[PDB]
Design a protein around this nucleic acid. Structure first.
Lengths: 129, 144, 150, 81
RNA sequence: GGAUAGUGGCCUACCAUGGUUUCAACGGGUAACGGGGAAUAAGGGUUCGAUUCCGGAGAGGGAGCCUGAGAAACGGCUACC
RNA sequence: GCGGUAAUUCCAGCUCCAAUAGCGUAUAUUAAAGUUGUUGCAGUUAAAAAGCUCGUAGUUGAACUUUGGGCCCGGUUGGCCGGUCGGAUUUCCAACGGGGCCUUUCCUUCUGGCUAACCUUGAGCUUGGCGAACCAGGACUUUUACUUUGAAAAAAUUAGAGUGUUCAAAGCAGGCGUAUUGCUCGAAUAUAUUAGCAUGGAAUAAUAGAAUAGGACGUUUGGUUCUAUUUUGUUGGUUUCUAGGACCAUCGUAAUGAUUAAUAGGGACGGUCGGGGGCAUCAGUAUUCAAUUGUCAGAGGUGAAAUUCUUGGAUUUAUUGAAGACUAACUACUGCGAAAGCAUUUGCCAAGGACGUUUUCAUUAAUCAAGAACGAAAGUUAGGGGAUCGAAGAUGAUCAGAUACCGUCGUAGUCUUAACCAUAAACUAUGCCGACUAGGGAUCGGGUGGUGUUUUUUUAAUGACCCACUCGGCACCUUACGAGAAAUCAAAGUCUUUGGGUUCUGGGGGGAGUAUGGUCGCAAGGCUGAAACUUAAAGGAAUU
RNA sequence: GACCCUUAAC
């Protein structure tokens, strides 16, 4: 069955990005998905995305620029201490000067550098680069 | 999902699965069964001393043709009868019979060193004197 | 999908987007309520009530026109079945298969199907005891299922 | 087809696809006002009725259940919605 | 209730089958004293830890005890093997 | 691998190389080993997907509830560059990290000896009042996991600061003078395993609240035990309007109060569809007959024969015939079933997928140790049937055979059981569920749209065809983006740019699927399952 | 129709 809607959303984005398509339909649009996209959008990896309000669960159409190389989900959402952020960024990000580990902390969904300056931590959601 | 469970609460399954599958490793199985302690003739030690019982003419395994010089040795601590190679040229005349020898493995961790069938050990000392010393004339075996 | 089959069919109602509907319904909500009640008093299940409401009357669905779903209406005014209609039909099916099996002992297909039906009964009854729709210690018993169908 | 307006599909494309595959799923069925000849007795009938509907006046069955849309009886007239 | 410095089935006078268990009880093995640690490392790990420190146990094997604040002490005693 | 009479491999001499007061060897162990794989393995064919389904534990599990907008602020400000040292000043610009206040927003409100932010006010600022930068007096901060923060790893060790042990390992020492007095810095500092506290953290993820109200609000009106201090003659008990944790006792107030209906799942209904299943019936060849008639004498069988049958008539010809099995041709890159499997007609009996649905329930789900149903053929008890073919069992060719392959026979062997057995190259050698990623036609079901073409009594219910869709299914055209060792792959892709959920299995070849064992079975055997020992390969896919 | 086998000897 459906286990992680973020995983299917990020898979749809990855498969759309790999085939050159500038847009992708996402079902069924959880709030975690939107927060993951806004972090993506804030750094410019996607562009504009529109939520579609079917009265059931929501649909997303994301406009895609060519910048995103890979977005992913880390399953399960591992617990990440402040000291464990370095291991996660060095394990999955392509370099040190770009790319973001996206984690959910009690201060909200954010990328790893924002959690470093806000000095927060939590569980890892995924990554974008 | 790659087979193995991934859930954050599946540590026990991953632990037990690893435990079961380490038994397919030869070294882990041999170590935790204690085969060297219970079956190997040195009892798990690097060296062993014994008494020469007979000179041997072990033929070479194919494709090489040679007579490897070996000695039947009954180990002192066990009484187990093993075959030890006398390595260098003419060193059989130093290890003739009934003497006390020091034995070591061949470096194969219990297999055959070369074309010598069934021989696991080699001679390193004769009557307290290193076989390399007798072969290089540096020392001589006690005549009386 | 299809718990007990390899079928992957996706066929279902497409509920309309509009919540407050249909704007051609000239009847009242209270007129739909009593119409539901007079159907239920005649021994009709909520599924049969909704089909007749949607068929011979202009009832999109009770939830849209009235405030509540049909099973909610029946429960509110005391016409709720003692066991849920979906579990009831599953037990009725198991009873009819079991009656068939006692006349055809070589029907191994029906023996395999009976296992599937009672697996569904036990999984559905467990859900109903969890949400306390069925009392705890309620059990599906094959021997007494036929007489205690109603 | 790399670039597509997935927010504003054409009505032809939306109508072509399955009712659950449109941007927002909607029922393709409809309700219709059916009357027998003579007495008006307007009865609202579901298109996919699946039960033989007769008017409230008497036994004047108006449609026959079918695997899809209900077929209307021989002598009758219907208006959409 | 007795015993103990004291709690306590620690032991003595009753019902109930009470307690544990696939989240592995209970058995078996350990070339098992535990730990601080050691060796080896990209990151995770694997192996070891009799042994300079800490805790435990023992004085050939068991058992029992005197004195003493403190020992079931062994360069204290008593007995058997 | 070298040595089998010019061996760069042995024994030596010369020469040379590596490390060097150290250098070999043996045995373990660590890395190498992404060959144990959480990171991070492999399972179509190299080892490996259980035959198939159900199913408990375990693991995992759709979406939704304050996602926004204004105001001001003691706070490293990088620079609008030498007002806080070859040297830098918050006001014409930083992400301001954070704080408080409004925006329906609420971080529990009341005892008083303190009277705090408030138009209750003596000079460009308090001589009466509303509360957290202040305070003891409430059973009540839903339950947690996951924060940041650290009251803590005993020392030693490790990392590491300083230091003129000559350097260094080390050690925790030391350093400097009025030549002669004395003074002074040290011996810091650091979660390589996990459970208590944290006026600031609710993002992530669950069996929490109010559904036949038993709900909330309390200073509405009552009334129902109370070890009751403060005040009234024996110590103490017996008594009121009192301040306090009481029943929903009620002519109160409250938009009074169970989110969506997941291209999740279950259930219902409708017209269908299918060689899905079971029980009865009903039809189509051989084998053996019967009474015909035919006869030379052949028939049968083979590579060629022979075994064999033929007056007693074989074989062959042609209507009432005793049986048993099988269901041809139609029959397909077709259908159904969980697989095994399922193909004459009709009746009966329950079942099922797909479709359609503006029906209903509402997360009931996915996968699953243990556990359970079914499970070809062969085989095994037992009664019935036994036509056909035919493991076993005798002629001929081979001859060195042929106790094989070929002929003719022929016992056991495919129906009903308490029935058992439980295995197959049970194969797609591809576990299941879910999502996404290219093309193009066809087909099976089911729907939708075309007054499309053709059809009783000919153009008065329909059916069968044709186009266009659509859902589900069986499949189908490439060394194709991608994957792969390749073969090849519509998944075997989305996999070093490595994580959707989950079950099972493998870790060089052999010994060996071989038990000292256990368990199931009537047995045959099934399931579980080593070690010694021995090997340098065994193996996969290509190429020539 | 029948058709088995093949160095220890660099």
């Amino acid at each position: 069955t459906r286990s992680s809607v973020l995983a299917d959303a990020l898979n749809a984005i990855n498969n759309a990005e790999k085939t050159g398509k500038r847009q992708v339909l996402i079902r069924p649009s959880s709030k975690v998905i939107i927060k993951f996209l806004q972090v993506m959008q804030k750094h410019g990896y996607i562009g504009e995305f529109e939520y579609i309000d079917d009265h059931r669960s929501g649909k997303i159409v994301v406009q895609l620029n060519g910048r995103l190389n890979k977005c992913g989900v880390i399953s399960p959402r591992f617990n990440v201490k402040i000291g464990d952020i370095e291991k996660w960024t060095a394990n999955l990000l392509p370099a040190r000067q770009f790319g973001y580990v996206i984690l959910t902390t009690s201060a909200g969904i954010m990328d790893h550098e924002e959690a470093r300056r806000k000095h927060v931590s939590g569980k890892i959601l995924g990554f974008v680069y | 999902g790659k087979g193995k469970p991934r859930g954050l609460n599946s540590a026990r399954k991953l632990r037990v699965h690893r435990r079961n599958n380490r038994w397919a490793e030869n070294n882990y199985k041999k170590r935790l069964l204690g085969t060297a302690f219970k079956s190997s003739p040195f009892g798990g030690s690097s060296h062993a001393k014994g008494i020469v019982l007979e000179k041997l003419g072990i033929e070479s395994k194919q494709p090489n043709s040679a007579i490897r010089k070996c000695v039947r040795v009954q180990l002192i601590k066990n009484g187990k009868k093993v075959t030890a190679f006398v390595p260098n040229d003419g060193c059989l005349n130093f290890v003739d019979e009934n003497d006390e020898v020091l034995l070591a493995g061949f470096g194969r961790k219990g297999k055959a060193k070369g074309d010598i069938p069934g021989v696991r050990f080699k001679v390193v000392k004769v009557s307290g004197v290193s076989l390399l010393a007798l072969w290089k004339e540096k020392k001589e075996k006690p005549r009386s | 999908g299809r718990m007990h089959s390899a079928g992957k069919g996706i066929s279902s109602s497409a509920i309309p987007y509009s919540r407050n509907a249909p704007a051609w319904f000239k009847l009242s909500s209270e007129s739909v309520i009593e119409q539901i009640v007079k159907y239920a008093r005649k021994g009709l299940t909520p599924s049969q009530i909704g089909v007749l409401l949607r068929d011979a009357h202009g009832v999109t669905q009770a939830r849209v026109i009235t405030g509540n779903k049909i099973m909610r209406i029946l429960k509110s005014n005391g016409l709720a079945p003692e066991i849920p209609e979906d579990l009831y039909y599953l037990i009725k099916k198991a009873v009819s298969v079991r009656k068939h099996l006692e006349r055809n002992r070589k029907d191994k297909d029906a023996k395999f199907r009976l296992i599937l039906i009672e697996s569904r009964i036990h999984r559905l009854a467990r859900y109903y005891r969890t949400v306390a729709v069925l009392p705890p210690n309620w059990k599906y018993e094959s021997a007494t299922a036929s007489a205690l169908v109603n | 087809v790399l670039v597509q307006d997935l927010l504003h599909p054409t009505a032809a494309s939306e109508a072509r696809k399955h009712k659950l595959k449109t941007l927002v799923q909607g029922p393709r069925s409809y309700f219709l006002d059916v009357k027998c000849p003579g007495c008006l007795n307007i009865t609202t009938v579901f298109s996919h009725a699946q039960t033989a509907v007769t008017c409230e006046s008497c036994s004047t069955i108006l449609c026959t259940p079918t695997g899809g849309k209900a077929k209307l009886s021989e002598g009758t007239s219907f208006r959409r919605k």
